[PDB]
Amino acid sequence: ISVRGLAGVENVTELKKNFNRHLHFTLVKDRNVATPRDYYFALAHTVRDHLVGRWIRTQQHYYEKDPKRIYYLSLEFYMGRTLQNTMVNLALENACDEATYQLGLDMEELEEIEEDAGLGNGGLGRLAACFLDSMATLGLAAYGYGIRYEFGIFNQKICGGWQMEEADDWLRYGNPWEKARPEFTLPVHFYGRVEHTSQGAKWVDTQVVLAMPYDTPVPGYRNNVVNTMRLWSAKAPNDFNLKDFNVGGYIQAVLDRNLAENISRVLYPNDNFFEGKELRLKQEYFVVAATLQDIIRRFKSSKFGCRDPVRTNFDAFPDKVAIQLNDTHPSLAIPELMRVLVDLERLDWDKAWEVTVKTCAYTNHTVIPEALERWPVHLLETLLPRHLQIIYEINQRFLNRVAAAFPGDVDRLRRMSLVEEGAVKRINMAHLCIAGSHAVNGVARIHSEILKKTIFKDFYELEPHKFQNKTNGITPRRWLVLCNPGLAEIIAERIGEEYISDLDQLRKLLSYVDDEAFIRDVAKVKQENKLKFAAYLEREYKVHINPNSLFDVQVKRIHEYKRQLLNCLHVITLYNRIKKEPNKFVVPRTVMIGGKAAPGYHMAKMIIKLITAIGDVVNHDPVVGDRLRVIFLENYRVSLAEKVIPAADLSEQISTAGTEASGTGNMKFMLNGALTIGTMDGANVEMAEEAGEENFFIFGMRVEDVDRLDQRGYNAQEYYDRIPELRQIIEQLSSGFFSPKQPDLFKDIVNMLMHHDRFKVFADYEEYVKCQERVSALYKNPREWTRMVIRNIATSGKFSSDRTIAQYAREIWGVEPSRQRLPAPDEKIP
Amino acid sequence: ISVRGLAGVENVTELKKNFNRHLHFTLVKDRNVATPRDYYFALAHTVRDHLVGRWIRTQQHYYEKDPKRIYYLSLEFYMGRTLQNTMVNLALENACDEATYQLGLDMEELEEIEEDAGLGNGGLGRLAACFLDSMATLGLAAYGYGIRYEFGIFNQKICGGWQMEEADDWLRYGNPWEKARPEFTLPVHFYGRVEHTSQGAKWVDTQVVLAMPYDTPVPGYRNNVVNTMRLWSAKAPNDFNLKDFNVGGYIQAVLDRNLAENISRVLYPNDNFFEGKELRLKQEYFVVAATLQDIIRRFKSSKFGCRDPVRTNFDAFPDKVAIQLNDTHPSLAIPELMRVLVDLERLDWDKAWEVTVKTCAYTNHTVIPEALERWPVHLLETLLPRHLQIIYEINQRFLNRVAAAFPGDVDRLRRMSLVEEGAVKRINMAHLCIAGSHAVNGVARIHSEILKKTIFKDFYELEPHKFQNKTNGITPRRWLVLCNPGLAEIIAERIGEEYISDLDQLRKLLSYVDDEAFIRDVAKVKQENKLKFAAYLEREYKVHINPNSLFDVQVKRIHEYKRQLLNCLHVITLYNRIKKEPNKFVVPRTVMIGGKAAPGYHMAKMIIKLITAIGDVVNHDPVVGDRLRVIFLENYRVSLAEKVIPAADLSEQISTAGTEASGTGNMKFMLNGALTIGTMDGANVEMAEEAGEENFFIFGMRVEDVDRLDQRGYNAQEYYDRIPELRQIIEQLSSGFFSPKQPDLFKDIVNMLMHHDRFKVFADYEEYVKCQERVSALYKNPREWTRMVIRNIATSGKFSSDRTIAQYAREIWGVEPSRQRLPAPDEKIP
Numbered sequence A, B: 001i002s003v004r005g006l007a008g009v010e011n012v013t014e015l016k017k018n019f020n021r022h023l024h025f026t027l028v029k030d031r032n033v034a035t036p037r038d039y040y041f042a043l044a045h046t047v048r049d050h051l052v053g054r055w056i057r058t059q060q061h062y063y064e065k066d067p068k069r070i071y072y073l074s075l076e077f078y079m080g081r082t083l084q085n086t087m088v089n090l091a092l093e094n095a096c097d098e099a100t101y102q103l104g105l106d107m108e109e110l111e112e113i114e115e116d117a118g119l120g121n122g123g124l125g126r127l128a129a130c131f132l133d134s135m136a137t138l139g140l141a142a143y144g145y146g147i148r149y150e151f152g153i154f155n156q157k158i159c160g161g162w163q164m165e166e167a168d169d170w171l172r173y174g175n176p177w178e179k180a181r182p183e184f185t186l187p188v189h190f191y192g193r194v195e196h197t198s199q200g201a202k203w204v205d206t207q208v209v210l211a212m213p214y215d216t217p218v219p220g221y222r223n224n225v226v227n228t229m230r231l232w233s234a235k236a237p238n239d240f241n242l243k244d245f246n247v248g249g250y251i252q253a254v255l256d257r258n259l260a261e262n263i264s265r266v267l268y269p270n271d272n273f274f275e276g277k278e279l280r281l282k283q284e285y286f287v288v289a290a291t292l293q294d295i296i297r298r299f300k301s302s303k304f305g306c307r308d309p310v311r312t313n314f315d316a317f318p319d320k321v322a323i324q325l326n327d328t329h330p331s332l333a334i335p336e337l338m339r340v341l342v343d344l345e346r347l348d349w350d351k352a353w354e355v356t357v358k359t360c361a362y363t364n365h366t367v368i369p370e371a372l373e374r375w376p377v378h379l380l381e382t383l384l385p386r387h388l389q390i391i392y393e394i395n396q397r398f399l400n401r402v403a404a405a406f407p408g409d410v411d412r413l414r415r416m417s418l419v420e421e422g423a424v425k426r427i428n429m430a431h432l433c434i435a436g437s438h439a440v441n442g443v444a445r446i447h448s449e450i451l452k453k454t455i456f457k458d459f460y461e462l463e464p465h466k467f468q469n470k471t472n473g474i475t476p477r478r479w480l481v482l483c484n485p486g487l488a489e490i491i492a493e494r495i496g497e498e499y500i501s502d503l504d505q506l507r508k509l510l511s512y513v514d515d516e517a518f519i520r521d522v523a524k525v526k527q528e529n530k531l532k533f534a535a536y537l538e539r540e541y542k543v544h545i546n547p548n549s550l551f552d553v554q555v556k557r558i559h560e561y562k563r564q565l566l567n568c569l570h571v572i573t574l575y576n577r578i579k580k581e582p583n584k585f586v587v588p589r590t591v592m593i594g595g596k597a598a599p600g601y602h603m604a605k606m607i608i609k610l611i612t613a614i615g616d617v618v619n620h621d622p623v624v625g626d627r628l629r630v631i632f633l634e635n636y637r638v639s640l641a642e643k644v645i646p647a648a649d650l651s652e653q654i655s656t657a658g659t660e661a662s663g664t665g666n667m668k669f670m671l672n673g674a675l676t677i678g679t680m681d682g683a684n685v686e687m688a689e690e691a692g693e694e695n696f697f698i699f700g701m702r703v704e705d706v707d708r709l710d711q712r713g714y715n716a717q718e719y720y721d722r723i724p725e726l727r728q729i730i731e732q733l734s735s736g737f738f739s740p741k742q743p744d745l746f747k748d749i750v751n752m753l754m755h756h757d758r759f760k761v762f763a764d765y766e767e768y769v770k771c772q773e774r775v776s777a778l779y780k781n782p783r784e785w786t787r788m789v790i791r792n793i794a795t796s797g798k799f800s801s802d803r804t805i806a807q808y809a810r811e812i813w814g815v816e817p818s819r820q821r822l823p824a825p826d827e828k829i830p
């Protein structure tokens, strides 16, 4: 059937009876009233049963051996569905497929019922998910720590061409994967004041919110390692949240509990944008405060909570603990670790600081200013008074270091301060992270260089040793074996299965680049993939596409820097050329644009309306026929990505040079047989460098050109004046060609494009459509297109998250990865 | 060990492996980190497994055979713990006791970990729970329908002698008994307006709240019948509760969902008191609206949703459906049933009314005015506009009936109206229920007569056939076999086990009233019970009592009509007499008073403070010694009742004649070997009548005397003037003898007692202490005390809820009870 494992005789039988056990005893249903949803849960529970045994021994193991622990703090974990992934990592896929088949059910139909764990916005959240999978696969004693939002990223609905947001009640029917652990609930404090008494400061008169943990298993790839993702939930104490007496109402007091519990109710839907709301700051301290207590508790036991030197010496803390900050969201971990060590454990400042810096590491994910976290001091002042005092003290000592290093450099001092003066004083969280971490890294080579040359230049000059790079990656399990079994099979037919946990081995595919059968096969799976997606489209969304055309897709969050608008200009151009010479042949294309717009991002929502507007015109023009279709992919999410990427021919990664830190969708497309048209931005550079620029469609300004233009001054009118095709499009938008009933509908877009385009869309227009012509040319030659595809796939190995994690492990965490199978799952009951 | 069933070889082994399965697979723990709480859950899950099989076949059965269905609508279901009860009804107790013993655990210790399902206030809620158990035991196709509050009755804490309320987070660790059924979620409407168009009215522009059901199994006693208790939970729709667009905030919109979901957040803690809050009214319509849809859906399928006459003829609705209204809380079921039949199904008014009256029955539980539900019209007008119109129309037609029956009786018309004029117009829910039901019943013989003679006199004259009586009862399973296995065993040793489901058989115990061994045994279990309670006291609450003294207990909600104050006067009297003649012998007593005070009931909270105040003095007087102890039983609830009642010697049921509708605690004490001192009120009359007044300690005014006094006019000064002992107590309270630091602390109590005692405490004082002297006399003669006890126990049979339910069944529902074992639980998987 494929190498989804063995469909053993004893195990298919075993699976079937357990499926029935759960349907009866767990779901309390009988075959006569069971629905596909019930069948999905019975299966989910049956599958979950197989990893609890391994989950328990893995955790017990780490307790016995006591290795260094890695704590990945992130406010986002974009997990997606987990049924299939679990089957794949446990080699259960074929057996489950067989068993359910014998039970008369279609596993694929049941898999579609599982709700996505959308506790993420985009790249940053999904990176965290891929990392978890890789850390498990590499045998690291790692823990994912976050917030259990009851409402993840909103579900997007298109109404009249506009985006409509609606609550993502992903827990509505329950989550069979998580395990509530109310017995490990911890208290978290807010507000209050600071008392300075005799021997130390005291955080007093605080409001208490409880943090209840929920553990979700994270299985490594076929190695019997099952790590843990711990998500905190906010709960109100039953005392003060009722007991602070003297009139108000008993009923009201109980109803008001949903004020402390609002902390974990919803994820902020912002991608690369900072919103300084109090609720957000609360979420940030909540995950940090709860997590740290858990970390220290584990440390106090270790082998120190037995003997060792005997005296809670936190000197070995950094040797046993490593906490990675996914961006600045969990940045409060630094002053919080200090607070606990100094205020509670009573360590001297300097010893505490040494420990803190040695256990913390910070990862930066963007350079755009509006995404940078700068919290107003009056907010920190009210909500976390002691942390503000600690931050000021950290700032004081850090600046003294600078002054001593750069005597008399008074501007450098203000530039480097953690405190920003002006309208309102703010705290620069990024500056805090650099000061309190022993390592700072970018997510792509160019992005990392930009940090050193630009944004964090002064910090780099001060401590050059802190700055590193760790190019992002993706997990070959979910992003290849899971979503594209067809491609994984044919690769396996030639080079084996060892590449799934050793993606570099894909290079061996280079020697089949002239293999006639392989070329035919690679081309076949892609055709099968396109057919299945074209079908899904009519199934779930309804209104035909042509599977023979070039599948041109751009899927990612809607942003001005991502330039979906530039994609728009090209689409309209294609349209206008066809209308000019109708009876001239052109390579057919289905251009699919999908992504979510943050609810408050007006421009982004205007772009979504533009895309649908273009489709309204283009898709109903008889002269165009089936040569050009414009489709907006609704509710783009992980589960939808697993469907479109394997069916894509052309991947669009056209952000303005220097704005996309890395990107990961680009890597997803490369490993799945799509060719990339893009700019020398983020990881695109390393991808082209790995496949060879001849096998990539690069165009546009490089970073240098962008800066040259800025020195000069960007004037969009120039481009409008010298390019008639561009001029024609702008006047079409301006006159209502794409919006008849509301002719001025797109005035904001035009206005922006002509007067305040921060991402110089026009500057890359000419080189973009010219480059697009080159891909159309190559698509006309199936054999050569496929051979170039093979060159990309065979060369994507470097982009696996296993590589990324191995580097973090060795160069930052100080731990050694291991592909050693944990000693079976085998029963056991001590 | 006892007749807690057989500890079979095959089943103890089977139990143990399933206990281990759950501890591993369900709880995801290993013996080395498992806590008593984990052990309790493993067991709970193991036990629950045994009734799912029966649960499924019971429900399937009713679907096949299609008998008349009984729907018990109540806003309260005071369930308590359910582990032991389930073991008892499935004959699993000894086997579980053995198995857990072999696993090295103490079952009793694990049982104490289960949280109480406190979804009730007192009598009314517990009655509903006992009824459910009896309906299951009598094989009735019955369904309990209510609200799943996430916070039940508050947990009471005594601080400085005052009651402190704190949220009852009973779901904190989960509920292994319930089964969420999200797939059966239903919509419920609120607000909106009424449109009158061509062919009918339309309820329009309403706000939608979703009702999600949670099913809990209700097992009959050893007959393999497992009925269902369906509890609704409020959930916000994800559309409008987000989709009603045009600025407000996406985050805020999501946070605001906890506005629609507040409907099922907390139970109103009022016992016999009406609070006209909007939230309450919402709860009342919510349970009614959701339940009715479920009822009609089931009816539409039946055997009509196949064939029958073919034409949704609701003429057979009353032949297939019976809905019992537990008080007026679910009274909206009447106009709601009309709304659906008339507005949606399109039946003519008269045919609809006939159906409604024929399927609905109302049970009244109190005659005190402040407990009567009278909803302001402006509230119904805003929240349920169509229901108000329907009510007015029902009123119009009803009054026309009256006018026609009593021509010219204009005062009768206003008196009987469902609408009450005055300050604000109100709707008398009780009048509504009588008009729309074919049966109205009281809960005790005297209470039922009082309804006919007083409160509902006019209604009785109009339709004498509607009024009946159904004396309350209690379940012998929980209230005897479960809480007092020792007593159940010795009874079983003489007369067998058939009495558990046929309590009348207890009469056979009359022939052992002179049996020397029996008297010794009955006396022994009570001594063992007192010793165990005296121990629990020091274990969980701490500060000694004497097990040889007379256990004088009064446990029920704190109310002015219950007269805990009269009990107080007696206690102080005993104290004063001892202080007067220290070296005179008196029968030692431990008087225990426990109960909860509604948060807004100032007087009730003042009485709790008085009780503790008396104990502060009495319990620390050296001259008193161990002859008199005053203890306030904290957090009185079902699980606590199962502990005190079996250990009680004297039961206090001293409410003012005519105020306690029935009472059920009194029955609990009688069947558990306690003697009753009380007034001729509620069911006390029938109890004394059943045991013989010689075996009861009756005192005080009868109803007639109360009324005589009211004609005359009650003057408490008279009593104060003629009784020096009474005078001495009042002056002690007034001067601060019981409250030194705050001498005027009890001025409200004294003031009330002397000037506004609605329950004439003083009028029954003299006859009360005189009667108390008689019980002390009899306690001095152990042999005769025990023989009188045997006379009560042997004669309590009539007070089993099986008797009560059999009468409801035959005289109101029109169904026949059956003690037929359902065809085993045996596997099966169709």
Ligand SMILES: COC(=O)N[C@]1(C(N)=O)O[C@H](CO)[C@@H](O)[C@H](O)[C@H]1O
Residues within 6 Å of the ligand: A122, A123, A124, A125, A127, A271, A272, A327, A365, A366, A371, A443, A472, A660, A661, A662, A663, A664, A682
């Ligand atoms: C806070 O900045 C970010 O979130 N940055 C992003 C992203 N928005 O997902 O992170 C991911 C993961 O590193 C990068 O691939 C992407 O280029 C970058 O923009």
Ligand SMILES: COC(=O)N[C@]1(C(N)=O)O[C@H](CO)[C@@H](O)[C@H](O)[C@H]1O
Residues within 6 Å of the ligand: B122, B123, B124, B125, B127, B271, B272, B327, B365, B366, B371, B443, B472, B660, B661, B662, B663, B664, B682
């Ligand atoms: C609404 O009135 C009531 O709730 N009445 C009560 C009770 N408060 O529990 O109901 C129970 C059950 O019928 C009666 O035994 C008790 O005397 C009566 O007061």
Ligand SMILES: *Cc1c(COP(=O)(O)O)cnc(C)c1O
Residues within 6 Å of the ligand: A121, A122, A123, A126, A555, A556, A557, A636, A637, A638, A641, A662, A663, A664, A665, A666, A668
């Ligand atoms: C991989 C992924 C992303 C990141 O896309 P980029 O193109 O790097 O912005 C965002 N959303 C989903 C659902 C993803 O799978």
Ligand SMILES: *Cc1c(COP(=O)(O)O)cnc(C)c1O
Residues within 6 Å of the ligand: B121, B122, B123, B126, B555, B556, B557, B636, B637, B638, B641, B662, B663, B664, B665, B666, B668
């Ligand atoms: C039986 C019961 C009641 C009713 O007591 P009465 O004396 O009838 O008021 C109230 N509370 C609990 C916990 C009960 O078990």
